[PDB]
Amino acid sequence: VVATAQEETKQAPGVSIITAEDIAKRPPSNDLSQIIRTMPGVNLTGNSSSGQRGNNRQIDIRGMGPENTLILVDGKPVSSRNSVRYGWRGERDSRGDTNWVPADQVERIEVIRGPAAARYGNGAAGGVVNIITKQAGAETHGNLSVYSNFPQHKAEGASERMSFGLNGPLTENLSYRVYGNIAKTDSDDWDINAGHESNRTGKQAGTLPAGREGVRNKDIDGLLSWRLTPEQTLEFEAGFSRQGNIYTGDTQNTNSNNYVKQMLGHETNRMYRETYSVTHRGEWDFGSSLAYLQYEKTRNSRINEGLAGGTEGIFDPNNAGFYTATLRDLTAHGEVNLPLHLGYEQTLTLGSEWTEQKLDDPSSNTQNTEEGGSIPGLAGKNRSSSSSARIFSLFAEDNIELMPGTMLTPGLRWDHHDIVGDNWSPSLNLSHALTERVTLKAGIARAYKAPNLYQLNPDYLLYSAGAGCYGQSTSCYLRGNDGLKAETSVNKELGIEYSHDGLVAGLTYFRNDYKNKIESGLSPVDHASGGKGDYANAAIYQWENVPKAVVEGLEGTLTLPLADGLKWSNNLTYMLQSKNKETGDVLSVTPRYTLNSMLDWQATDDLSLQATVTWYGKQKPKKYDYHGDRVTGSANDQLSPYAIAGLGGTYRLSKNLSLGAGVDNLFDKRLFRAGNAQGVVGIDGAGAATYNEPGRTFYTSLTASF
């Protein structure tokens, strides 16, 4: 019987899978992105080409940007970073959504890039990362897993983590699985980048771009599984997580004030994430079914910042204290899977999804109209905090065996956004055996991304006095736009792969024609009226659809069995293009290439040793400033190629106890954040030098299990 389309397309060229065993061998400090990023066609990248919040790097697929990476936990969406204000340059003061699940309670991670991702609907344009948690088995099992690291250079933050799982039957009909976790990544020190900063003059002399922000994680999760009947299983799950930061002086434009200096080392933002889900699985005569409901409540509490003026994107000393933004996201999903025998062996999947997102953010819509002038249709003051959107979806996929060795997997997805309207995402992926050892695979599909609630909301208004305004130097507004189109991306890949006796050699070409990407507008749509001074009658820009952008590249893989205990794995990504075809500017700043190499030696039954090297290519920043003018000076600075090497091992003391130890970045190659891409008054830009690369870092781990 032929697999589902969902399962079949997990073999597409753009899919990589990281196993629990992979995670144990190459344990991450804390956030899972540290291992996810080492897959081909994946980068660890800032949210925004401006470099703003540049040390908060996140998973970026094929140069599409972090905003286009849809993160799932056991198939269910994570949306929590949407509680954090999305700014003029697509910046978000967010660490991302890859740190909600403790690494040692993960069963596997599916990284799904390109055409095979589009079927996952809204948000899957770059791709999909599905984090799958370990589940209960027949008898009662459990673990306790500990990890600690030790930076060579004390200015770089060390991480400690402890997590435990326990699972197995509860009655005849009933099973549970629970886990919990406590973790701390320290922040880098306030002065880590001193000596490396962009040129700063006048008022801004002495200022510093910050290193990486710290985090404190508390997570717990509980799942109950109930067999009603042979055919029918019902699952209840709740999760509660808290992340509090450790602040080291990051501000939007890398200035300081005393409220910043006062908060160094303290908690300045906290994220609570609550999840509840219920899930029904049935095994039937005609096939199979799956349904679920998930409620995710995210609370983002953080210190007040300004949206313009002297307090833009920095703690506001005259409005001290915190606000809370609240996101409520409800997701419901139903499907059936149908083995059909006559004609071709095939398996039909039919389903739907409904989602609602409610956002309440009392800091985001509080820019008044007093300086730039008033805007018809927009109340200067006391605008509604909340926004919302719903998407209802229908889909059909069929996995069709034409002959042995040939599979065709067409699918169609339909989405109704209750504001933006209808969308169609057609999908085709196929596999073809050329010989017993060589396969050809290819795909093309149209992925879908609805505009985010900030971009869609006419109550969302930003202001500039001049510096931020495209095509001009006088004052403007940027206004949300509820008549936006969705973004779509026609994403294609072609892959050929040789495979025999664990020898694997493969090469894949990919290309995304990215349509109607949403960005801050380039031409005024109107002008405000009144205001104060030369700024009065400000230009009104909207959030607007860019007609065309493109990324293109290659992914390559080579795995050699050098000997029985000894495996040499390599992957290579080469970026051919990443262009916004309206502005001629770069879409997402990624290295030109990434080559990951791993040597894995099973030295004994009980001992395993690993060496790794990663080579990154050149990075080039934005050509143009917010005006559309050619950038000059250090704002043109590029990062050179460099390499990062590691070693580690795992020693199995018994069936119940394992330990790991190693060193990351063994030759201690370090990079320092010098600033954002472009400068502001008194602070030069730093081009591509927007992040810290940590230096040599030792680590130990221990895992007790039964």
Author numbering: 16 to 721
What does the primary publication say about this deposited structure?
These transporters bind the Fe3+-siderophore complex and translocate it into the periplasm. Pseudomonas aeruginosa, a serious opportunistic pathogen, does not make enterobactin but does possess a TBTD outer-membrane protein PfeA, related to FepA, that binds and translocates Fe3+-enterobactin into the periplasm.
We constructed four mutants R480A, Q482A, G324V and R480A-Q482A (double mutant) to validate the observed recognition site. Each of the mutant proteins was purified as described for the parent protein, and crystal structures of each were obtained. Neither G324V nor the double mutant were able to form a complex with Fe3+-enterobactin. Unlike the parent protein, the R480A-Q482A double mutant does not coelute with Fe3+-enterobactin. The same titration was carried out with G324V and R480A-Q482A, in both these mutants no binding was detected. When the double mutant was expressed in bacteria, it was inactive in 55Fe-enterobactin binding and uptake assays.
